Design a protein around this ligand. Structure first.
Ligand SMILES: [Cl-]
Ligand SMILES: [Mg+2]
Ligand SMILES: [Mg+2]
Ligand SMILES: [Zn+2]
Ligand SMILES: [Zn+2]
Lengths: 6, 71
């Protein structure tokens, strides 16, 4: 899946 | 300027916050806070196809990766 990390 | 629009996302309809983890639904292409949809940042690398709670109903449940890159 595509994600936006912290 | 001050009257510019800003993109909003997720079930909560908030603008992006770089301090919060998000995952893209492969179906609707919206983005979701892990905390809003019950996905932990550390569990996400195992998700192959993510479907949000709304898209699940017609597009099926999220799937898991059958293989992973170690290293
Ligand atoms: Cl796979
Ligand atoms: Mg959070
Ligand atoms: Mg991988
Ligand atoms: Zn949210
Ligand atoms: Zn969706």
């Amino acid at each position: 899946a595509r994600t936006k990390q912290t | 300027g001050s009257m510019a629009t800003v993109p909003v996302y997720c079930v909560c309809r908030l603008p992006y916050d770089v301090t919060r983890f998000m995952i893209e639904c492969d179906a609707c292409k919206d983005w979701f806070h892990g905390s809003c949809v019950g996905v932990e940042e550390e569990e996400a690398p195992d998700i192959d196809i993510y479907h949000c709670p709304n898209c699940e109903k017609t597009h099926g449940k999220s799937t898991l990766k059958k293989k992973r890159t170690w290293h």
